Amino acid sequence: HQAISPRTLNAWVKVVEEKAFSPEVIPMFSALSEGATPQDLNTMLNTVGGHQAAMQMLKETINEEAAEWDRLHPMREPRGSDIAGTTSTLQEQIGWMTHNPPIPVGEIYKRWIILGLNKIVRMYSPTSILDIRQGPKEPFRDYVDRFYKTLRAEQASQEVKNWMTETLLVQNANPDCKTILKALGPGATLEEMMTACQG
Amino acid sequence: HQAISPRTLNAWVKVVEEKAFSPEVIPMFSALSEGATPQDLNTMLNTVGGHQAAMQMLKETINEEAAEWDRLHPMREPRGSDIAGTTSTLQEQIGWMTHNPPIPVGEIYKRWIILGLNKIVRMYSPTSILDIRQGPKEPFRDYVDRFYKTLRAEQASQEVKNWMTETLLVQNANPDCKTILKALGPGATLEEMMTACQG
Amino acid sequence: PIVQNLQGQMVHQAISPRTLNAWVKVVEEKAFSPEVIPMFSALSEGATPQDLNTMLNTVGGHQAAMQMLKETINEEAAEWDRLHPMREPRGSDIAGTTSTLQEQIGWMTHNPPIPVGEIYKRWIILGLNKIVRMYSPTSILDIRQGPKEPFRDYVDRFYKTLRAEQASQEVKNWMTETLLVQNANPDCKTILKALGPGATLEEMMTACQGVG
Amino acid sequence: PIVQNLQGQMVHQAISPRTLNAWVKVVEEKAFSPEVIPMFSALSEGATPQDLNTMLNTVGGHQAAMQMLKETINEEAAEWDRLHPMREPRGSDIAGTTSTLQEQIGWMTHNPPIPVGEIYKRWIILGLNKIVRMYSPTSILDIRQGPKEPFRDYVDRFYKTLRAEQASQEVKNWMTETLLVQNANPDCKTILKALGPGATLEEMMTACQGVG
Amino acid sequence: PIVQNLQGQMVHQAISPRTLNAWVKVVEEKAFSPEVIPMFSALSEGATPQDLNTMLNTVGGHQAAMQMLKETINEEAAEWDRLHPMREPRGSDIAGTTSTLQEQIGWMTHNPPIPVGEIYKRWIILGLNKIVRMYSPTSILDIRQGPKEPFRDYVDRFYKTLRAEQASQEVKNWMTETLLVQNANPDCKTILKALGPGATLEEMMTACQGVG
């Protein structure tokens, strides 16, 4: 067994602190927590200072997923709470991972954490995408960058996102860009839209 | 035996001096001092520059724990001071950990440090959980953040913490949010409560 | 009541003087609240018709209540004689005005027993229910929670008035479901409505604890 | 109850009318305070399931409380049948709705006795505990000592509310240790904090006598 | 209690349900006034240790009072075992936790009788005295006659507080002699002092009748 690096822990704390709960924190967490035990994941979650409302929401999501795991599955076999790391121990976790075939308790807990963090990101998105409107002289590149950051935050359905990018993206634009976008018409990819709408 | 890394030592000193004494200091210490000998733990504690009142408190609590160990427990078997590393050598400390069987001299001293840090954090918390109260205009998100930071610093049993989580969060809210939370009723979850009290 | 002899024969047991005094205190001090009927049911456990008549002699002091109690007993006796035209108990015999004590004891010891005492007790309870319905100080629609009254006190008053009114069971269910919320004070009424329809009384009381 | 005959045979003893009237007074006048459960335990000493059902007929007047009492009795009967699949007492037999009185008497006189009465009493006490938890006028966090209230009255109110709330034993211990000091008025709270943690209630009451 | 059989054998008599309910009312409604101990002595006449434990189950609802009552019973049991190292009653046997009912009945019917019930009653009374000493709302030095209070009411309050405090007999005599005069209002205090020292309470009350 290898411990998580202090550099990795500091990186996780720093990215969480600076970015709050922007959508990129999920891929950053998945990158930093590769091959991590439930003990390591619990350590990384505990070391986060601030946003304790979000961390409690994550705890409640973990508890709900553990209850679902226990309902689906009524040495000692790993229960849902055992996978969560609250009741298990490091030796048990490593044994479960080393078993052939393995019980990837780390990946299950990571998936639960990812679900909780997606819910946190959706809750913490600053404004709804309907309110993302271009300014009178804001660049179209800046406005569409903001629009797509917000759209990534919402995590709406695929069809809903398609409709949004097709219709609301041009609807919320200022008249100067809006006229050009309607001239391009429906079916235009984003590349074509803003490469024709530049300047 | 490995020497404690300068990067790890600087990280511990920086987190202590920057966060003063917050609840995250306990898991940060547990993560940094993984597989640490009593000499390494003493190095980590002594290297801290400021908060010398808190370090004296931690020394006092370590002394009390060593006295309790001496009372309960009348390669030589180590005494409390021997566990604390005040009257033991590095070779003797690696003894009882490489021994067959090994008694975890490092983990016992780490546990004592954890108890002392728990007391330090409990008192360094600004207000008690019962005294945490939402302001007339405070948003529910920041009120919840303060509440759960204080609960993390509360230093009570887990059942009592669960009761606090279910009751005091609703009880301490301002009437504007208290009415909405009562309409939600018991059985709600923090996501639903925060979405309801967003306004 | 009825008590077995030392040799197994069942013989009449006279109602104790302090039991009668307790019934007198219930009749005189309680002012015909809804709780007189539970207390009448408790004090008259196993009572024969003669004992029941002895108890009714105490409520005989009130002229109107005694009159309606007697008329209701007569009506139920007429119904009994209509359905039921030792000897068979007649309507007046159940009341204990024409029969004799040994006859009542024999009826109560039949195999299967003839529950004459329970029948007369039920008729008396019907009459007492009517008397309680008269003496209710307010109707259910006039019960309103005060601005500062706790919801527990308002619920207790509401259900006491509901017991006094004695409407139909479906009407009673509708009343407890809807009129309880309607008559609550606005701050409590908001939470009651927010709970939604079909909420159990436990949910309403837990949600509204300390709101007043 | 159960009473021995003159020749040694154990036979059912009917619950006295004034005992039932006392239970009725507890149910009707006390408004489901925490003290109803001690009084129910006292009045139902040695009671059989039939006697317990007779007592429950009086609290049957309140619809909500009766409903939850019946549902809790049903739940505990289901648990009993789960663990326990003359004849063996079934869940409905313990309640006294399907069994017969002689069967209950025989169960209570077994060697060793089958404590059917105590079991049904415990189920009823669970239901009454739930009913008391509903009717509590305030939660424990809302009990606060007044500026002039003596600490004895505040402690009595606090422990009454604690009995009404019925939290976990560890949570209850934490509450009496901490929340009692927290909710005390400032002049009394100063002495409570100065006493330090772990102080017994006797120390708190003796130190705070006359402070208010 | 204990009751003789029809053939002369002494057998255990169960404590009546309404006696237990009376004890429950004393425990719950009286708030541990000094009068609970006379009432406990009255209600527990002839009680066996099992009956006493049944009565203590009702005061078990209060955690602190039950804890000190149990610890005082344990202390007196330890003293009994120290002085006293069928079979001899042990300390736990007097409490009725280890012994059996027939053993207690046999002890109470010995020639001369072994007063186990009175011993356990005395231990319980010691514990109740301690509990009453805690719950006293004011100390004896804080009892002061009001400007308009009659001397009879002030004397009654003073002696109630004296019973609650339970000081030494010599200290109690000094208190009733001196502190009663000291705390009286000035117009009554003048007459009390003019009566001189050693005046009986009858003289003080007769002289001060109507002064307030």
Author numbering:
A (entry chain A), B (entry chain D): 12 to 85, 96 to 220
C (entry chain C), D (entry chain C), E (entry chain C): 1 to 85, 96 to 222
From the paper:
We therefore devised a lattice assembly scheme in which purified wild-type HIV-1 CA-6xHis is anchored to highly curved ~30-nm small unilamellar vesicle (SUV) scaffolds doped with nickel-chelated lipids. To determine whether SUV-templated CA lattice is comparable to that of CLPs and authentic capsids, we determined the structures of SUV-templated CA lattice in the presence of IP6 at pH 6.2 and at pH 7.4 by SPA. The global pentamer structures are virtually indistinguishable between CLP and SUV-templated lattice preparations. Although our CLP assembly scheme recapitulates the morphology and composition of authentic capsids, it only works at low-pH (pH 6.0 to 6.2) conditions. The liposome scaffold-based CA lattice templating technique we introduce here enabled us to overcome this limitation and to study lattice assembled under more physiological buffer conditions.
The mature HIV-1 capsid is composed of the capsid (CA) protein arranged in a conical lattice of hexamers and pentamers. CA assembles into a conical lattice formed by roughly 200 CA hexamers and exactly twelve CA pentamers, the latter of which facilitate lattice curvature and closure around the viral genome. Monomeric CA consists of two folded domains connected by a flexible linker: The N-terminal domain (NTD) faces the outer surface of the capsid, where it stabilizes the hexamer, while the C-terminal domain (CTD) forms dimeric interactions that link hexamers together. Here, we present cryoelectron microscopy structures of continuous regions of the capsid lattice containing both hexamers and pentamers.
